[PDB]
Design a protein around this ligand. Structure first.
Ligand SMILES: [Mg+2]
Ligand SMILES: [Zn+2]
Ligand SMILES: [Zn+2]
Ligand SMILES: [Zn+2]
Lengths: 168, 114, 112, 307, 164, 214
């Protein structure tokens, strides 16, 4: 529904604002430098925490809007198939893509992908798929989604052989 | 801690000691030229390094496209154009310092807030 | 939850649970039986608290009691009015009889 | 029962995933020991008499962590000071008259420079490290040092002698830097302390999540960390169960092993029943010693040639 | 007695070197000798810790920073207490002291390590405690034909479970 | 302080572990004795200013009435604390001869540091008297007080034979335990002995098991 979609949009927007504020603080060289962790590690932790909170909040918002005549709601509270995260990803937001915990690294020098200027850490440049499966993905986000899926496939293809050996 | 080469044959002078007047004779080993050094400091280690964050300032950084652009002013020329980039010395340990270079004054300046 | 007093005041039973509850209020014999059973219970409590050091109570165990006593109620129509005809001596003998008739190790020697 | 247990452990290892090792490779290591570490961590519990004293916890950390000169040396430089009893460096005169209130030494000064924070983080005043190297040799090195109250921390040292001294001093200071222990037991690296809690029995006979501080490490050793003061020697624990077995006997070995395997297989996809896991532990430990299921480990038993 | 007279000579030298050249020379050498006896009240040439405390006090007098300690010991600072101080970290001078506490505070901060904190929600209930403080995760473990795992982590008691 | 206090406290705690060794091995020691406080220990064993004198600090001990009542054959034991950091061949030779003369069958020997093989080649001499070696570093902390270590108890030969006849095993199908095991060395048992193990199970609480020291 329209108003709920608008609230989703502004929720993601204020999350982006929090991220930008943190980046300004970091680039102004005053940070708490979180204990046990290096400066960049603290920065990455803060931003990933913010983005995942955004995704969770938006998904909860969509779910609590959703009508009782909605059939995917009917299945998901009826047990069998689907999930909260499935509803959230098909309607509200995909969320930040992942390559072993760290988000998408600068394979190209200083940048993730050749469509941006160097030395960014804004989430859309490094791979936050803000959008949703209903609206489809901007092509950069499409690429990062492909990265995450490929990681899952290769992990399956190695773990199956090793677990078979070690079962025998 | 720098090296001084023998002027007579381009080989670095080595520390060797006056056995009686007690002076630093940087002597050549290739030829017999000898030289008196200036300070008793000879060897130097620096077990901790923290330098290199402003590397590779070429005279024409602005010719690259992929550097971003901003609107801070050069506090020498106050031109509103400038170019900024991350610290160059890529350790796991470095900072988020931005180094601003302006095309007009060709001058570098940072944004530290200590 | 567990402590019962038959001669003192504070933990005295309501005598309408059992029709022969009034007259037994005062017997030293049944009081002794209840007291030693209570001591047995508190020894079990100390033992469990030293084996499960955290205090987790949910554990995998054999045959469930709760369903059995529940359907016992739903079969034999317990009410809210009739005092039970159970007697204290009957209860505390029956538990120990079941306690021994449980059998995992057949045998005759001391070790078994 | 054995086949039942084997299948019941095998199948949920198939749907299991892949800082600290976990997952499939950790399970392979602990099922296939292979005394290699990759996370040799061991948790240390404090003495209960020190419940929450952070300074006490740091004090135990400073007692336990291994440190050499790498940990403390900022700067090293060499010098030719010709005068055996006066200094070419202007600043190092008060130090000279401190240590002057036994002459036949090379006039080749070696100079060191430390960090005050890296000294008193571990409560090393530099006085005992100066006398520490002094008692380390006592035969070849004059060792002269500053006060701990100065704004710069320097160690003055010269070789005594009964040519070529540059590279001997280089080798000597290299050995200096490398091998002089300062405090703490070796094979223990940077140690951190977390703020845990424990469902302790309440004094009124209930349970409460009372917090306490725990020392945690990134190396392994056992024969010494039990012996340090201020520690609980009873509840110490290590992931590397082979060392647990060696120090504590194979009963504690198999208990630790069962703890480890339960931890790995209950990180996700819990749970299997207890008895299967216990049977696996017992058949892997019923020889008086640990026996990995390899091409050789259980295979080289006095067992049927056909199987 | 050689160590006695040597410490006395050093003390007379450093108090004669003071900016307040004391005309009470006998009084200040009385201060010197009474500091000598209260100093040897620790060990009296029996342990090297006597020499260590001697180094501490001698260099503290010398240091400059600080110089005012000379006048303060000349006009007060009753030395039998200053046998039993051991308390060089709290003297000569105050700015270095303040530097010491801020160094120690930063060290204590850097000692205690990683504290990742498990962002939550409130929808599910605990499998054991049965309260709603539930925290989760996403990733997919098995083959591609199925969705994520929907990891669970309770925080009211610390319980873990899972939902399909 | 410097190392004197650590040396004193380490010696004190090693003495504690010693003492409880001998106590649970079955020799008769007053319950107050094992928690003897450190300052009292030092007052008992300071010579001049801080030095502990280990030579006289050793002691004899006697089997309990109960341990005699089950086990018919244990003579008095005897402990030792040599003061040299090394181990002297003549020193231990005097030790083993003193054991022989006093007619002892179990001789507890504690070394500060390494033992030269010449001073330990003749350790397995004079049967049936047996000689046992220990480091203070191995004795600074009682092993059994660790909570992962279950209770260990010893089997008489009679009840061991009863166990074999009941469970119909033959003497090799029991799970084993090494001679070089820490708890095995704590108990001091030798080849062919059976240790009953009581550990706190989780599906029945209390569970029994046995091992063989082979
Ligand atoms: Mg066979
Ligand atoms: Zn030349
Ligand atoms: Zn400018
Ligand atoms: Zn819970």
């Amino acid at each position: 529904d329209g108003p709920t979609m608008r609230e989703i949009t502004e929720t993601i927007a204020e999350a982006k604002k929090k991220v930008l504020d943190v980046t300004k603080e970091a680039q102004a060289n005053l940070l708490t430098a979180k204990h046990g962790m290096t400066l960049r590690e603290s920065f990455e932790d803060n931003v990933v925490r913010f983005l995942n909170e955004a995704r969770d909040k938006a998904g909860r918002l969509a779910e609590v809007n959703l009508k009782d005549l909605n059939n995917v709601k009917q299945m998901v509270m009826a047990g069998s198939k689907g999930s909260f995260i499935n509803i959230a990803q098909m309607s509200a937001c995909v969320g930040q893509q992942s390559v072993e915990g760290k988000r998408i690294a600068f394979g190209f020098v200083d940048r993730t992908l050749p469509h941006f200027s160097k030395d960014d850490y804004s989430p859309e440049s490094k791979g936050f798929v803000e959008n949703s499966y209903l609206r489809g993905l901007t092509p950069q986000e499409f690429f990062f989604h492909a990265m995450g899926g490929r990681e899952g496939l290769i992990d399956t293809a190695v773990k199956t052989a090793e677990t078979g050996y070690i079962q025998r | 801690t720098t090296f001084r080469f023998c002027r007579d044959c381009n080989n670095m002078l080595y520390p060797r000691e006056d056995k009686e007047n007690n002076r630093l004779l940087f002597e050549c080993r290739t030829c017999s030229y000898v030289e008196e050094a200036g300070s008793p400091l000879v060897y130097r280690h620096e077990l901790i390094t923290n330098i290199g964050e402003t590397a590779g300032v070429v005279q024409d950084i602005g010719s690259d496209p992929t550097l971003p652009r901003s609107d801070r002013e050069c506090p020498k020329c106050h031109s509103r154009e400038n170019v900024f980039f991350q610290s160059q010395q890529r350790r796991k340990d470095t900072s988020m310092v931005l180094f601003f270079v302006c095309l007009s004054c060709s001058h570098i300046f940072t944004s530290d807030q200590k | 939850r567990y402590r019962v007093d038959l001669l003192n005041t504070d933990h005295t039973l309501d005598p309408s649970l059992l029709e022969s509850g009034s007259e037994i209020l005062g017997d030293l014999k049944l009081q002794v039986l209840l007291d030693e059973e209570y001591k047995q219970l508190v020894k079990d409590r100390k033992f469990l608290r030293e084996v499960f050091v955290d205090g987790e109570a949910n554990w995998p165990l054999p045959v469930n009691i709760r369903r059995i006593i529940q359907n016992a109620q739903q079969t034999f129509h317990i009410d809210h009015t009739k005092p039970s005809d159970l007697t204290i001596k009957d209860i505390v003998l029956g538990v120990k009889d079941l306690q021994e008739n449980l059998l995992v190790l057949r045998g005759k020697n001391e070790i078994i | 029962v054995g086949v039942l247990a084997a299948q019941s452990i095998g199948e949920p290892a198939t749907q299991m995933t892949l800082k600290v090792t976990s997952g499939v490779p950790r399970l392979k290591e602990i099922l296939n020991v292979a005394k290699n570490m990759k996370t040799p961590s061991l948790t240390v519990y404090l003495e209960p008499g020190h419940a929450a004293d952070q300074e006490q916890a740091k004090l135990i950390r400073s007692a336990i962590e291994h440190t050499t000169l790498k940990s403390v040396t900022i700067a090293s430089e060499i010098y030719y000071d010709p005068d055996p009893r006066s200094t070419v460096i202007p600043e190092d005169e008060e130090i000279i008259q401190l240590h002057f209130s036994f002459d036949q030494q090379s006039p080749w000064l070696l100079r060191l420079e430390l960090d005050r924070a890296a000294m008193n983080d571990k409560d090393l005043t530099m006085g005992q490290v100066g006398e520490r190297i002094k008692q380390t040799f006592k035969n070849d090195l004059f060792v002269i040092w500053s006060e701990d109250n100065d704004e710069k921390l320097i160690i003055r040292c010269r070789v005594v002698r009964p040519a070529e001294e540059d590279h001997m001093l280089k080798k000597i200071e290299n050995t200096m830097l490398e091998n002089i222990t300062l405090r703490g037991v070796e094979n223990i690296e940077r140690v951190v302390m977390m703020k845990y809690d424990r469902k302790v029995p309440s004094p009124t006979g209930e349970y409460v999540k009372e917090p306490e501080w725990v020392l945690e490490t990134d190396g392994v050793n056992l024969s010494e960390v039990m012996t340090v003061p201020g520690i609980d020697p009873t509840r110490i624990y290590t992931n590397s169960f082979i060392d647990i077995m060696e120090v504590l006997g194979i009963e504690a070995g198999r208990a630790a092993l069962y703890k480890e395997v339960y931890n790995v297989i209950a990180s996700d996809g819990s749970y299997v029943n207890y008895r299967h896991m216990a049977l696996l532990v017992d058949v892997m430990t019923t020889q008086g010693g640990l026996t990995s299921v390899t091409r050789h480990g259980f295979n080289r038993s006095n067992t049927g040639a056909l199987m | 007695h050689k160590l006695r007279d040597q410490v006395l000579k050093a003390l007379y030298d450093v108090l004669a070197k003071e900016s307040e050249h004391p005309p009470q020379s006998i009084l200040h050498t009385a201060k010197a000798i009474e500091s000598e006896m209260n100093k040897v009240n620790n060990c009296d040439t029996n342990e090297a810790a006597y020499k260590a405390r001697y180094r501490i006090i001698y260099s503290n007098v010398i240091s400059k920073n600080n110089p005012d300690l000379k006048h303060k010991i000349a006009n007060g600072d009753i030395t039998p207490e200053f046998l039993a101080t051991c308390d060089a970290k709290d003297l000569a001078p105050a700015p270095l002291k303040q530097k010491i506490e801020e160094i120690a505070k930063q060290n204590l901060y850097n000692a205690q390590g990683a504290t990742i904190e498990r962002s939550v929600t409130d929808r599910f209930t605990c499998g054991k405690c049965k309260e709603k403080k539930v925290s989760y995760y996403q990733l997919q473990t098995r083959s591609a034909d199925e969705p994520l795992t929907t990891f669970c982590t309770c925080e009211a008691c610390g319980n873990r479970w899972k939902f399909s | 302080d410097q190392e004197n206090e650590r040396n004193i406290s380490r010696l004190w705690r090693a003495f504690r572990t010693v003492k409880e060794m001998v106590k649970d091995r079955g020799y008769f020691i007053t319950q107050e004795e094992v928690e003897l406080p450190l300052e009292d220990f030092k007052a008992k064993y300071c010579d001049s200013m801080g030095r502990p004198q280990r030579k006289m600090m050793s002691f004899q001990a006697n089997p309990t009435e109960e341990s005699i009542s089950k086990f018919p054959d244990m003579g008095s034991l005897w402990v030792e604390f040599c003061d040299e950091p090394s181990v002297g061949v003549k020193t231990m030779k005097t030790f083993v001869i003193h054991i022989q003369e006093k007619n002892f069958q179990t001789g507890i020997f504690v070394y500060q540091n390494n033992i030269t093989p010449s001073a330990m080649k003749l350790v397995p001499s004079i049967p049936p008297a047996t000689i046992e070696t220990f480091n203070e570093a191995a004795l600074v902390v009682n092993i059994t007080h660790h909570e992962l270590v279950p209770k260990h108890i010893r089997l008489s030969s009679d009840e061991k034979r009863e166990l074999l006849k009941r469970y119909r095993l033959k003497e090799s199908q029991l799970p084993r335990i090494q001679r070089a095991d820490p708890v095995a060395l704590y108990l001091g048992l030798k080849r062919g002995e059976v240790v009953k193990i009581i550990r706190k199970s989780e599906t029945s609480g209390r569970y029994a098991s046995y091992r063989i020291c082979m």
